[PDB]
Design a protein around this ligand. Sequence first.
Ligand SMILES: [Fe+3]
Ligand SMILES: [Fe+3]
Ligand SMILES: [Fe+3]
Ligand SMILES: [Fe+3]
Ligand SMILES: [Fe+3]
Ligand SMILES: [Fe+3]
Lengths: 244, 244, 244, 244, 244, 244
Amino acid sequence: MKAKEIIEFIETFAPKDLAIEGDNIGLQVGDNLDKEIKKLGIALDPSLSVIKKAEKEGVDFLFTHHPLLKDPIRNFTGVIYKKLKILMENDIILYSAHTNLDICKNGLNDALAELYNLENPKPLYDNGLGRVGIFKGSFEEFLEITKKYIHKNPIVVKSKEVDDNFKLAVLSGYGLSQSSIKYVAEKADVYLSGDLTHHSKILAEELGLVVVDATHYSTEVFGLKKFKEFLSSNLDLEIISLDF
Amino acid sequence: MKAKEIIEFIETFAPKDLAIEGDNIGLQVGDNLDKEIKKLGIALDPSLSVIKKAEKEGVDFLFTHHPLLKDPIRNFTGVIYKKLKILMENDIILYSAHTNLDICKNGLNDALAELYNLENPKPLYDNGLGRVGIFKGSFEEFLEITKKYIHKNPIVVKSKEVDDNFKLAVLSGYGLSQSSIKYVAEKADVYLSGDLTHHSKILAEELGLVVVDATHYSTEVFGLKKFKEFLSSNLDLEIISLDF
Amino acid sequence: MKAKEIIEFIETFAPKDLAIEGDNIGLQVGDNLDKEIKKLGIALDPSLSVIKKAEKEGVDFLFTHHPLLKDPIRNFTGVIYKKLKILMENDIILYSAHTNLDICKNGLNDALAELYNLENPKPLYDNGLGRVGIFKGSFEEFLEITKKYIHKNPIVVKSKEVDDNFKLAVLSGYGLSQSSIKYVAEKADVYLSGDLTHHSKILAEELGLVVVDATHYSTEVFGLKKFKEFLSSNLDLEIISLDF
Amino acid sequence: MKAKEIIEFIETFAPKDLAIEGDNIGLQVGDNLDKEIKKLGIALDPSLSVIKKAEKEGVDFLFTHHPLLKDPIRNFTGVIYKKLKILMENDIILYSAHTNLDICKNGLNDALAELYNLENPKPLYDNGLGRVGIFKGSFEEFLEITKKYIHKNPIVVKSKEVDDNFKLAVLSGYGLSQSSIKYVAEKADVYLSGDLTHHSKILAEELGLVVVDATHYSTEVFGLKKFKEFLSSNLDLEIISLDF
Amino acid sequence: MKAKEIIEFIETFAPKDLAIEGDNIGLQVGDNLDKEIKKLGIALDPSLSVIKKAEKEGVDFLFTHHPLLKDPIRNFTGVIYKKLKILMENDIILYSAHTNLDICKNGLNDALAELYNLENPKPLYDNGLGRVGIFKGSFEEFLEITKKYIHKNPIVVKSKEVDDNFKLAVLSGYGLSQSSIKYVAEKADVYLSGDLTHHSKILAEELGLVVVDATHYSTEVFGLKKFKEFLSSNLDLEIISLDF
Amino acid sequence: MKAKEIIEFIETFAPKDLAIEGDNIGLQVGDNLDKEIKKLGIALDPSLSVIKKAEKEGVDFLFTHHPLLKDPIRNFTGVIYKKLKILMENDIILYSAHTNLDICKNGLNDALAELYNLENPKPLYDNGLGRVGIFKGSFEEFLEITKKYIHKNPIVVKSKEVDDNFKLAVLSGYGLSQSSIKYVAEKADVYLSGDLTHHSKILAEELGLVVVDATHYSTEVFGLKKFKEFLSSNLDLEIISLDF
Ligand SMILES: [Fe+3]
Ligand SMILES: [Fe+3]
Ligand SMILES: [Fe+3]
Ligand SMILES: [Fe+3]
Ligand SMILES: [Fe+3]
Ligand SMILES: [Fe+3]
């Protein structure tokens, strides 16, 4: 299996056009895409220890959810120097599917929507991040599903009492920004996502939106694990995970 | 004491000139500054519940650290309508000292710098948020001070081992943005602040910067309490706190 | 009749999408739209004396042509404090139909076009402010219609002699800006609108465009009166005008 | 007297440094500044008729307060073609002192400040358009001076009653913009300027600021006439005025 | 033949919409388009010596490929004063067809594409500057065609050896910018255009794109001559060229 | 000599403060500045072939005048991948002094100013690129110096005849932009620089400014060679040049 053919496979599952404007998806680091791949590594972040571990584990193709850079740079020093040095010395390909993997069908957001068995699930935003639908059950049933499958100790901002058969909004990753709370508050009773901060918490309380922070990491890894299983089932390649 | 005279007192302590560019400091809500003040309320946030509590307790002058609005509006609906309705029905004056109170001398950042008895402390940024200096002691002595005076369970990102007599940077509030971690990594071994998120955590680990999240709330309330005592000692009026 | 149902009625007559980009139309001030309305007030401007008079006259629903704010603000002091205080203390709803009422069918611009009986009238701009068509008659017939129905002492910039059966352009409100004069000069012989200034007058003379300033107030009130009659005819509500 | 030498004289009186940012002051149209000048024409506006009149009367050097263009062009058609054609066929030099002539000492704003004998006058803005000081007398004395020296029928927006010895702000030209009324309301009881429009009128009434519109034209011609006398007294050439 | 009818003819051949965004095509200088034209002048640049020569040669209508101004101005001095003076004193019309003449059918780029007999030629950019296709022959055959019909001494940046039947990209005028080299390098083996500079040369060498600079002047004049022949064949007018 | 110490030496000669706004000076590629340097390579451009040649010759520290990137990137493919791969595999340090080396004293512009023995030389721009002064001699003496020390076949745009003792402006690199010709025409009779293009040539002819294009390459290499000798004389390490 050549590198281009792995990319071709991923892009069929999660087309790059789906990614929201400005998102740095696609090839991050690499030159020869007809190179043969004997081992595939998958990770949430293209972090320094992830890349170090990929080098140690003999990874040929490194697939990450988050891009290497979101802001363009014009100097190569410090950390990015260290990262690139390892990738280039071993000719390791770095490729990312970011929001296109969040948004696509059977993607990270769909994965959560299926975990909570939402009824008539819809995209939360038009672009089309997140899912929203009815959760058929009690708040404590919802909360135990979360504790068992996502994160053992989610932070709960219990702004209000939640009735059975409530609308649950899910967004994998960083979805608890102030503008997001305001947006989702008009569309859901409970919001499951990650990366809660003070102003977002205060805002959720005022708007009566119940927010459950299951962390950025856990809400994405859940889906990423499913995607890993999908690659394993369809690709005749060694696949390992590096940070999950 | 008239409202203008309380404002004159606060502004002598924390001049508005000190606030960073774009910060919405000063009079938030109010018209007649010759109103007499029998009771002053102080709060971290001008939240709905704080304002509700201010009304219930007969607060005349409501002082908050965070501004009512950071982004301007031209319509009055939902929460902001409710807040304004209460303030205006009782003619409660809302005044804020935000970053000018972070930056001034014996301000929120100085309060932290003084708790850890930083040696030769300097402003962390040019503008001049935060403090940085040498902590005379071990990392565990630093952490035990933190647990006792600030927050019992701070999140510690222990990127590396810390020698005694290390450079400590402190910043009250939201100081754990990605750009901030990058900046502070060049100036300190340990960074104490609030509102950690995933991308910032990964970055601190890569940079070898130790980050301690004692929460946005706690790192600012510590200083706000001292300022509350300062107001009580010098003004001859009842002073109550609403969200701390 | 509930507040939402009054809004629903106005928006059927003058859809909000019709309004030009950036125009602050719609709900200005209010929270509960299922509130019952016993008295409706209509005014050109949401001025302080208009709001004071609405409070004195027991107005429940205040409808204005001009929005309360065009530029967003983040502090509530002085005049806007005074205005909001009255509106919020009496729970008076403030709603505006601005350019959507200028542009719609049988709107303020159509009203003028029908007063002058323009033949084959067309929108003056593409967006689609103003009307333009042939006036069937002399300039002095046009001028006497204006003096009788719009304003007794219009300012006339008689740039040129005007033939019978000339093209008349009308724009209710502020239509005598420099760019507007330049635009209309290529499309009409005479331009009837409001708010003339020196540079616009000089420009009209050079371009040979005859401009008649019947004032911003009068050119809009004419149409606003018609709209008031329409609400009276169709709504079973007390309707009063506050500044006309 | 050569053109450069007239320019040198004017610029000694009203330095170009004084003009506010973006103001198109200086040489408007001209190539050879060693041309001899037998007749100098002065005007408020570089209008088509002024330039036509300049040609007819054999003006060599045309001095205007307003610039030929405020917004840049890259095509030459219509009016601007006609203007340039006349100027170039006769090699008439067009030079402007705009806001620098408003701001300088004994300039258009000083002229007004000196007519009302303002006490301890200061610049109204920081840049430093307009003047403000105490008028030693009654409002009717102020108005009678205005009617006799400036304009016989000024528009008066009598927002409130005015005590004797009030603070008067003067600004020659267009000073009655919405933002200006808001600014001046904080600094004066009465504001004298030109080019009133509807939204500015309403705002002055709300702010309790008395506004007197003596027209853009008249409030600037008053000063221009003094400057005309200054040029006659000091230059040994024929000086005529074209639009005043 | 009236001026408008010459313009109408050119615009049928090269529609103005075809021009890329921001391009200053169309009427440059002129007022009366029903003026009769007895002599037509065509030139690459509306330069001072071109305009001087047009005046001396009794040109009524001056057609240029490059516009008089690309950046708008608001002062008329120096060169532009000299140019306009001649054009306006003789009432010479200045009209330009710029990128609309580069892009249209049988335009300057098509002219080159036909000189090199490219097979299956396509627009180089989407907007739709330049042409690209297979050159049926050797590099030295290509080079001799260039030397015989375009320019005797083209600068060749021989980045690589070029095979027979290579892809040739052509762009008349300034096509050798850094971004252009990068773009074309992915689409052609050899790039024929004008205005080479150091950074563009260095870049071409790295990318292995062979660049032939036949100068901005020559690559456009070739097509301009063809267009001149077309006007001569179809218009019953005296046509002369001024700078070629 | 450690890398930091070579950097310290260069920066003493050409301070980074001197570089104009936005210029990407300093460390381009590198991580450990305590690396020992046995061989220093100097180049005009950090081109692919220069870096290839640097690797082949065992260069430890690669110093270039032009930066690696002027516009920031966030993906690593093609040429930039190849460059970084070589630099990182050998841990070759890439450092640039760009406009700061143009501007400093005895810098690239001074070198030219000193070759022509300009009298009373001053910075050409305020920032302070280029030099200008009187050349003591005839134009042919100037040209013969140019042909002997800079470039044997400079392109001369002889716009007009030049008197002896003329004002000469020199600027190493790309100084022949349209705006630059316009600027320099106001300050000098002859302008020596590099990278002439068509629109600049026409403009120089119109302005009567004599332009001599001795190429971007040659006008900068002349100074770079002197700087190379300066480094050899003061550092005790092997110094080689790669593209000159
Ligand atoms: Fe994420
Ligand atoms: Fe805060
Ligand atoms: Fe209006
Ligand atoms: Fe004016
Ligand atoms: Fe061209
Ligand atoms: Fe250079």
